[PDB]
Amino acid sequence: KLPTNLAYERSIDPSDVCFFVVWPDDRKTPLTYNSRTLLGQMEAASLAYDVSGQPIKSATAEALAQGNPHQVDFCHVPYGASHIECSFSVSFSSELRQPYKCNSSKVKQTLVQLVELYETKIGWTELATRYLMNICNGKWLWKNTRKAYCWNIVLTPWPWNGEKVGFEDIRTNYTSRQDFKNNKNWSAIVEMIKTAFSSTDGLAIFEVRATLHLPTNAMVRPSQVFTEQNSRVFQSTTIDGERSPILGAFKTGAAIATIDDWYPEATEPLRVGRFGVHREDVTCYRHPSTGKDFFSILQQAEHYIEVLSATPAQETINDMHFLMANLIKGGMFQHK
Amino acid sequence: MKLPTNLAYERSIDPSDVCFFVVWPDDRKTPLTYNSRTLLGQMEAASLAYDVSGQPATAEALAQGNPHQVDFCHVPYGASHIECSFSVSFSSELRQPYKCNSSKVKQTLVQLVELYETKIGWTELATRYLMNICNGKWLWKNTRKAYCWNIVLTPWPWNGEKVGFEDIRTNYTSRQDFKNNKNWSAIVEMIKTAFSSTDGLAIFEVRATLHLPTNAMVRPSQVFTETQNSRVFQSTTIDGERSPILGAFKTGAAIATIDDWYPEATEPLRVGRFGVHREDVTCYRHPSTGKDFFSILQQAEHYIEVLSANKTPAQETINDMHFLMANLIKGGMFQHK
Amino acid sequence: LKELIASNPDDLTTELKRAFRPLTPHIAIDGNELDALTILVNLTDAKCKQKLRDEKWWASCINCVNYRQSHNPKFPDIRSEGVIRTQALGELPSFLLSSSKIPPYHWSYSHDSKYVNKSAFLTNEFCWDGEISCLGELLKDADHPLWNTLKKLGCSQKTCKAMAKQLADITLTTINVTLAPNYLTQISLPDSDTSYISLSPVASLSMQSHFHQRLQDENRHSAITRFSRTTNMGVTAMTCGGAFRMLKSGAKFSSPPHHRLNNGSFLVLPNIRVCGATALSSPVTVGIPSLTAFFGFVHAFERNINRTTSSFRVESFAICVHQLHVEKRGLTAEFVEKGDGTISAPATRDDWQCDVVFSLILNTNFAQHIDQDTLVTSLPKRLARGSAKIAIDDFKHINSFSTLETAIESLPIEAGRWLSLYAQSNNNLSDLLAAMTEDHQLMASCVGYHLLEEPKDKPNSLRGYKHAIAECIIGLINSITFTDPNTIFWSLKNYQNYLVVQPR
Question: How wide is the angle at C-alpha B37 spanned by C-alphas B34 and B41, nearest 5°?
Fold first, then answer.
């Protein structure tokens, strides 16, 4: 139980996204951006009201009508383009089977036996379906597919004997979970994610592109930097000697690892983690005063081993989905 | 038997850095760069929420993220593949002591190496050292999650071609796969002539092509130092850029990862005095088990006379022979204290 | 230098802790010693020790001059088992440096981790009116002033003062390092023509304080090197625990011209690449390696290749540094035994190292080449712990020309910086930092060894040779765009008190 040196490494490795404009010639140019300074009103609540109460005497009626300047990095689709194309790649590996560092060899065989029992009594179908439904519907295009006409996704898997896989008109056709399962090769690309997790040194690699038909001069929203002045600075790259915005490397990984809806109130999915952090609501679920954090489940592994060796789906199956989806991304579990 | 007050051997293999180049589809080579990057992680530690067994940490204090700063390296968009260049030189310094305070252990250990290489050839140690250069174990985790990789090498001294292994995940799985190409035999035998002869030499220059996915990540070696900069890379200055190198004592640990004769012997280990592992850390061949190096070196007086008779047991004596020889190739300072 | 008119900075009590341990000039007292020695007795075991000064007074604080020393064998490897309290023997030319140019008084205590609190009362400095030294030398007579706390503080009785007088009579001559067994760095060099000498370089905390203190203004030349960990190396490491700042160039590499134009026996060697070399060469400088490393490389090369032609006699060498990159990497040791039964890693040290690309042109006495089968297998693979090799598609440019000016257009590398030295008066550090910012591509390498002992002999040497003890020389290294071949072509000379690679 927490043997003072324990670590895993990730089993799903995504990459940067890249943006290209296509013209009606069908030639492809890298999307660019540029800074601009702009003029806003004094719309705070702190230059006018004090802390806790009565408004200031220094904020008069012609100090609130002054206007302050700011800089933003601005990016849009050029006039005369046809659509945007976005490309990246994912790589499902088999690194969850054994811990990467384990000081005491007593919990190591416990974790190996737990992963094998979970593999053999429950499928790999639920986790692989929940991961693959986020790649081929544009969850990784965070708030770009909102306010758009349509967007279409094309897959190139490895290893593969055949054709590229095509999802088209995703807002209209692919609304539910059944709408994937009646694609003609849904159940042929889940199986390779399954045998990627199942084998000792298995591997699967997907290469993904997607086209976005945004309207005229529409706005494109890439990821941003952690700056400790300029507000809204973008994360950039260099494609064909240019400067282009990316939309993330870790942000893409956070986009396909939001499958957690096994928590107590259980309304809408969230990012798999230790203590169940929600980002809109700035509280957390899964708190260590509810017995549902990852460490209170990791300290019950022998109870799970003996219950998987004879299972009803009330919370035990959900707690071990949570444990396995937290070993697919996992890191240090040391406590110094 | 007693080891002298000072005793040390110079090493017999010495490699270099593995410098990375990227190639473009008009066939031009440029060095590979990296950048720092700050990033917003979560409160994920266990000391943040626990103290010994109980909790100190409110539910909105676990939900406030924290910044880190990493280095980050990847394959640039629109490239063909990655080239990796490397050098290694097998020599003959495993037979002369570099420093000794006596004369008996001197003559004893030089006649041990001559009786060894007469009765048991250098074919096992050379075919173990060489197939860590011909499958790319000098690329930790870069070989994983790639489509295919290829190795070519130029030996020296040589007349003829460049020796070439292609598509190593597919068809060069095993020992016989290396053993039945065109010229495995000459490159094994020149390592054998390097070890056997006095003041000989055998050099190899190796370079690999690695065929990664789109914007794949590159994983070089990291620095050793005890504000928020985790994951620093070891770099060099190559023709106007600052590039990642993948080690200089690390690649030597790739080549010398041959130890397979220890009391349970699951996977090969890096050779050393005590049989140290670091992932799933413990030291089998512990020095109380009598199977470290400072016990085999004491039993070397017996091992002199057992290689005067005819039939070695081939299990418990030649494994000690291969282990003592591998540590003599590795290096010295055997000063017992 | 900080007298009683400004003895109170009124921040906190760090002034006494700073002024006790030597990295800085000292404070002067005349009769106000009761402010110090009522804390000093209560440092071990403020107006409390006045009935218990006489305990922990037998021999414990008195014995810590025997362990006090002038030169530190525990740098940077702490298991050394020595004491060295002997300055030097000889004098130098003025452009070189040693621990002889600066006053010997900053000596301290490096023996133990539990007896750190016992180095008081006999290791510090008072600086009454000049000739600043420690307390053990100026307290060997009968008539001595400032004895008010002997006639007044009646807890100190008169029964152990004469033992402190008679115990510290002669201690400036005792040297005892024992090489059987420890972790002592030991080296060999030809001092005479045939009779080699196995000398041993050590570190001076006095030179360490001199090179330490001035650079706090100049953080452009700051190289923080935290060491073993401050428990057992010595209190001189506890004084500046963490920083340990040292000298570096303060600028990266640049773009020169190798040549603007276009004896004999010039043997040409291009494109030597050295990975994993040694950048921390001196105790005080961080940058390019020693020149004795290049000398040892050349001497090992000729002592290889004189199997058949024992007339080879390289006798001189010119060095051309084509590329230099220096950075921090560290070094992982291999879990050696701590002594009883436990296997774990040794202490953690922090390390600077460098990738050096350079070409040599030797000036031998043999008339022609040797071989190309047996030129490459005659060259060593080692240069100041590094791995130093030549690419095997570049063996064609090894040859022996017969004049210098035809050797420069046969190097297919083309960026210069040939190495000479700066032979002007630089007898401190301040006339080095006032000598660097004009071109600031300038280096301060290791130039030689100023000896200490005679030499003499004692058993466990390298190869029966004679073991002297020495220290380093911190001369300056400059560069040449390049024409007279005697401002280049270094050579080793012996002057019976030091060893310096000189350009003939």
Answer: 140
Could you tell me if B17 lies within 8 Å of chain C, comparing CB atoms? yes
Burial (CB count within 10 angstroms: exposed 0-12, middle 13-18, buried 19+), residue B308: exposed
Compute CA distances B280 → A5, A253, B223, B263, whole Å.
Answer: 9, 28, 22, 16
Q: Given 3-state DSSP classes, what are the helix, strand and coil percentages for chain B, each rounded to the nearest 5? A: 20, 25, 55
Method for structure elucidation: cryo-EM
- Name residues whose C-beta falls within 8 Å of residue B301's C-beta, 6 or more positions apart in sequence: B1, B108
Of residues B35, B36, B33, the one with CA closest to residue B79: B33
Instruction: Tell me the CB-side half-sphere exposure of residue A86, using CA atoms within 13 A.
Output: 28
Does an H or E element contain C185, and which? Answer: none
Contacts of B214 in chain A (CB under 8 A): 15, 87-89, 207
Query: Residue holding tokens 């598509």?
Result: B167
Q: How many CB atoms lie within 10 A of CB C410?
A: 13
Q: In 10 A of CB B12, how many CB atoms?
A: 19
Nearest by CB to residue A273, choosing from B44, B214, B215, is B44
Give residue for tokens 């007593």: A106
- This structure's resolution (angstroms)? 3.2
Class of residue A172 by CB neighbours under 10 A (exposed 0-12, middle 13-18, buried 19+): exposed
CB atoms within 10 A of CB C444: 27
Q: Point out which residues pair with C423 in neighbouring strands.
A: none
Question: What number of helices (H) and strands (E) belong to chain B?
Answer: 8, 12
CA distances (Å), A59 to each of A45, A52, C319, in order? 11, 16, 72
Which of B127, B135, B137, B128 has the alpha carbon at shortest distance from B188?
B127
Spatial neighbors of A285 by CB under 8 A, at least 6 apart, are: A263, A264, A265, A270, A276, A278, A292
CA dihedral B106, B112, B117, B119 (to 10 degrees): 160
Beta carbons within 8 Å of C479's beta carbon, 6+ residues apart: C256, C416, C417, C418, C419, C420, C441, C442
R_g of chain B, CA atoms, integer Å: 24
Identify whether the C-beta of residue C274 lies closer than 8 Å to the C-beta of residue C383: yes
Of C327, C329, C335, the CB nearest to B274: C335
